[PDB]
């Protein structure tokens, strides 16, 4: 696999280059309109995520089956870390899109969403307090992709995950951190991944209920959802 041969700097630039674009929402909120906007947005984002995934080193080396499985498992976690990332510079706010910046109050018009909104806000705050860098973010998001479904099936994925670990440490050492600071920061970042997993599970739980009508979800979102049901 070409991925293992990449240097740390090549891994980072490859990841930064694969980054998907920031999408806009459609041009107060109810419960149907909130869900409509988010569902529409997430749907368009999924298309870009799929093409981003193809460009995560190592992902292309997997069978089509394994690619489907990883994406089905990780898609909501990936949307979430993206959401918290771009919400960083907006304390107390969730920047779903440039033209759709929401606070926890709007989260209320959708039953069960305020709780998850609060978890997302806390994650963003944590990232902000930690001064998470773009290079670290793209490593974390790639980790979520390869890791989340790895035990739901493998050595290749694990070697690739190691490479990403190497890359994270490489970025920290270059940022001037001491050895102790490097390992502490590594752990801090990876533990946050457990919270992102938690948020995804909770959200998913709601989503494959709320499929039970409200809004007619897309066949794609549905298939992504059904994978968890």
């Amino acid at each position: 696999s070409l991925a293992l041969s990449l240097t740390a700097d090549q891994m980072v630039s490859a990841l930064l280059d694969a980054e998907p674009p920031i999408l806009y929402s459609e041009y107060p909120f109810s419960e149907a309109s909130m869900m409509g906007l988010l569902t529409n947005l997430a749907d368009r984002e999924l298309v870009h995520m799929i093409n981003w995934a193809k460009r995560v080193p190592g992902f292309v080396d997997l069978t089509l089956h394994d690619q489907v499985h990883l994406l089905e498992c990780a898609w909501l976690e990936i949307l979430m870390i993206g959401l918290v990332w771009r919400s960083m510079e907006h304390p107390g706010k969730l920047l779903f899109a440039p033209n759709l910046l929401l606070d926890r109050n709007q989260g209320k018009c959708v039953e069960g969403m305020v709780e998850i909104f609060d978890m997302l806000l806390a994650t963003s705050s944590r990232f902000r307090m930690m001064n998470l860098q773009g290079e670290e973010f793209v490593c974390l998001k790639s980790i979520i992709l390869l890791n989340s479904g790895v035990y739901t099936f493998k050595d290749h994925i694990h070697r690739v995950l190691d490479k990403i670990t190497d890359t994270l440490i490489h970025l920290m050492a270059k940022a001037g951190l001491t050895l102790q600071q490097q390992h502490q920061r590594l752990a801090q970042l990876l533990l946050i991944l457990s919270h992102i997993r938690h948020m995804s599970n909770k959200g998913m739980e709601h989503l494959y209920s709320m499929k039970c009508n409200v809004v007619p979800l897309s066949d794609l979102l549905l298939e992504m959802l059904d994978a968890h049901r």
Binding site: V47, I50, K54, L64, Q67, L71, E223, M224
Partner: peptide, 9 residues
């Protein structure tokens, strides 16, 4: 399924 298609395109 749709994901299959999107991944090859």
């Amino acid at each position: 399924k749709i994901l299959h298609r999107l991944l090859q395109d």
